[PDB]
Design a protein around this ligand. Structure first.
Ligand SMILES: O=C(CCCC[C@@H]1SC[C@@H]2NC(=O)N[C@@H]21)NC1CCN(c2ccncc2)CC1
Ligand SMILES: O=C(CCCC[C@@H]1SC[C@@H]2NC(=O)N[C@@H]21)NC1CCN(c2ccncc2)CC1
Ligand SMILES: O=C(CCCC[C@@H]1SC[C@@H]2NC(=O)N[C@@H]21)NC1CCN(c2ccncc2)CC1
Ligand SMILES: O=C(CCCC[C@@H]1SC[C@@H]2NC(=O)N[C@@H]21)NC1CCN(c2ccncc2)CC1
Ligand SMILES: [Cl-]
Ligand SMILES: [Cl-]
Ligand SMILES: [Cl-]
Ligand SMILES: [Cl-]
Lengths: 125, 125, 125, 125
């Protein structure tokens, strides 16, 4: 992986959530997520993928991951996906937008999905 | 997994893409994705998560997955995340919304992410 | 307006909501919206814009509109924007994706916005 | 309008775009938008709506607006909708997420819509 070394490690977003990830040489992301917001407690499993051979023209590295919000402490019957890109350097960042879907009945499916954006950095707010 | 049996298998969306997935007892999703649209050829790895203990009131099962659009044939420097829910029964479906992020420079990050929606069923269009 | 005649009139979405709109020669959209779903009763004002000189290569006509969910009967402290395109012909359609923002405190702004998609046609479901 | 006075005026986002708006007592937004990014030149008409009787518990004021990207200088065959909320006070802000739809053929409709987020303040970056 080109940014295997750059992506692997601990990241923090603007809410104070903590994203711990290992980028594998093949394109795998694995790790844990702890949200500072919402119906969440302690760490949750995450998994995702990244482009292991990004362009070399200054473009970011595309990636995504998923958390289902069930662990031994809580189940929020929901899942978030973050889609974004890693941008390396002295002020490295993972810039994302996310979709948070809740389990809903038929009648309520139209209101099942929240959208937002998180920016992750290597130092915490 | 409650819908481990229901989610595992082959799904098809409205574009004719094919989503092959195994749901693990823990909440894992693993499999392959073949897109009928866009800068894609053959199968790509996917990974994701689902709620393995959904509500029993008729609500769907929340889930999500990621594809990074790199394989041995093509690299589109991009990744899609699908966030949605599985709804079982005779007309089982996975209803999703997705975010497709491309690697972009600084100047172009504002235009890095497409949004859309896919509906997957067990029989093809 | 090129599709002034095509856009003007009554449209219905998959939820059974009714969208009544007048497209002005300049690019204006004005009208009323009645939602079959959610915290809504009777008609609400809408306003928006469309491309009054679309491409002639078979592409759709880009457009958007807003409803704030306050009228004399109800206030849901929220607003939806639909962004999409009109596609003319015998099976004319307005294909959209929408963002529904609620008024929220600081602590809750991350969960203020729902996302979805509506397809409008000239005949009702 | 409760925040008629607060919303009316000039706002600037993180890209340096300028949003000039008048909030009417009824819930109307009218004005002009000048984008610092993308296929845009000079000012474009906008129109939208806001909640003219927001909650009084510290929640923001929901609102939305549309720009179709046609004026006398340029036509980008596209339209953006911003959905968000006004938050008053010494550091007043309009926090938004947006959908930017381009006119596309049938074959390409799946890739017609960009998503992002803008934060507007009364002082420029
Ligand atoms: O709060 C969570 C789980 C934690 C999400 C944390 C989010 S992930 C994006 C953002 N970035 C973070 O770092 N943290 C936040 N899930 C909800 C979803 C909406 N829910 C319902 C309930 C009833 N009807 C509809 C919807 C209730 C449960
Ligand atoms: O086409 C793909 C990869 C395949 C995506 C297939 C998509 S996934 C959601 C939907 N459901 C499917 O089943 N299939 C489609 N990626 C693009 C993204 C945008 N790209 C750029 C290039 C230059 N600047 C900006 C953006 C070009 C590459
Ligand atoms: O239901 C409505 C107003 C009517 C929306 C109708 C929607 S527009 C897109 C779709 N297409 C239609 O044709 N119809 C639907 N608004 C909500 C939003 C979420 N709300 C809260 C409350 C508390 N906390 C958070 C959020 C409650 C009020
Ligand atoms: O660039 C613009 C018009 C100006 C948009 C400015 C955007 S509004 C949200 C953000 N906040 C701002 O303040 N400024 C930006 N429109 C594009 C859309 C994508 N386009 C295509 C072309 C071909 N195929 C697919 C898509 C090309 C034209
Ligand atoms: Cl609910
Ligand atoms: Cl580009
Ligand atoms: Cl609330
Ligand atoms: Cl194109």
């Amino acid at each position: 992986g080109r940014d295997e070394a750059g992506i692997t490690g601990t990241w923090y977003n603007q809410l104070g959530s903590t994203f711990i990830v290992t980028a594998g040489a093949d394109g795998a992301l694995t790790g844990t997520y702890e949200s500072a917001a919402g119906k969440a407690e302690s760490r949750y499993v995450l998994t995702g993928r990244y482009d292991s051979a990004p362009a070399t023209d200054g473009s970011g590295t595309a990636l995504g991951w998923t958390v289902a919000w069930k662990n031994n402490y809580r189940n929020a019957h929901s899942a978030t996906t973050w889609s974004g890109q890693y941008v390396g350097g002295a002020e490295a960042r993972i810039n994302t937008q996310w979709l948070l879907t809740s389990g809903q009945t038929e009648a309520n499916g139209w209101r099942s999905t929240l959208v937002g954006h998180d920016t992750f950095t290597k130092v915490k707010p």
